[PDB]
Amino acid sequence: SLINTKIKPFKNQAFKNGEFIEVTEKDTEGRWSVFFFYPADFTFVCPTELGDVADHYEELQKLGVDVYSVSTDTHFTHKAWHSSSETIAKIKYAMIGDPTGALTRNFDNMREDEGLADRATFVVDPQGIIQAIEVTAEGIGRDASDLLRKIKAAQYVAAHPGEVSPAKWKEGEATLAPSLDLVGKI
């Protein structure tokens, strides 16, 4: 159960906007982060999901949220994919390579018989605590707008302790304030 645990240290090469950079956990400290795992560069279902997040990246950045896509491919491969796919071309966040699989396994997200990461998305808060987890089968695409929903929910809860965001929570809704009075009445 990795929900509500702190992410483990890591150090990986990544491709980001035409450069190779190093990313470590220190980059994520004090920031909101999305770790977006996918199985394989040059595949199919994967780009539309990565592109979709890219579509939301301007808004994520305005909200102080960084994004890291991760596969067991090399950063070298990411750079190539980025130049040959016009969907991937629009990605401006870090594409992390994890050929040792270390980062994938920190998140218990390896397909051990394929040596590829599972389709998993992790939301990590500025204290390194995992606040949301999504994992789907090889054939089921994720939904970046729902990802946005959860991040805003997580950010809200962080900013209003003692308050919570209910089912269907969206921008500006009545929230709940835990209390002795509210128990069993809803």
Active site residues: 46
Q: Is 118 in the site for its own copies (CB under 8 A)?
A: yes
What tokens appear for 35 in the block?
A: 């770790």
Q: How many alpha carbons lie under 13 Å from residue 91 in its C-beta half-sphere?
A: 35
Task: State which of residues 58, 139, 171, 172 lies at the interface with its own copies (CB under 8 A).
Answer: 139
User: CA-CA distance, 142 to 140, in Å (whole number)?
Assistant: 7
Torsion sign (Cα): 32, 41, 78, 100: positive
Q: Does 41 bind its own copies (CB under 8 A)?
A: yes
| 160-179 positions binding its own copies, by CB under 8 A | 161, 163-169, 176, 178-179
Asked if 114 touches its own copies (CB under 8 A), the answer is yes
Contacts of 74 (CB under 8 A, 6+ apart): 13, 97, 99
- Binding-site partner at residue 61 among K ion, its own copies, none, CB < 5 to 8 Å by type: none
Question: Which segment (27-35, 58-66, 153-161) binds its own copies by CB under 8 A?
Answer: 153-161
C-alpha 146/C-alpha 115 separation (Å) is 28
Looking at the Cβ atoms of 72 and 165, the one nearer to K ion is 72
Paired tokens of 58: 């301007």
Which of K ion, its own copies, none has residue 83 at its interface (CB below 5 to 8 Å by kind)?
A: its own copies
| Segment lying near its own copies (by CB under 8 A), choices 27-35, 62-70, 157-165 | 157-165
Which range touches its own copies (CB under 8 A), out of 22-30, 58-66, 94-102? 94-102
Place of tokens 């990565």: 50
Closest approach of K ion to the CB of residue 72, in Å: 4
Q: Which of 27, 52, 106, 128 binds its own copies (CB under 8 A)?
A: 52
From K ion, its own copies, none, which one binds at residue 120 (CB under 5 to 8 Å depending on kind)? its own copies
Burial (CB count within 10 angstroms: exposed 0-12, middle 13-18, buried 19+), residue 164: middle
Residues contacting 17, CB < 8 A, separation 6+: 92
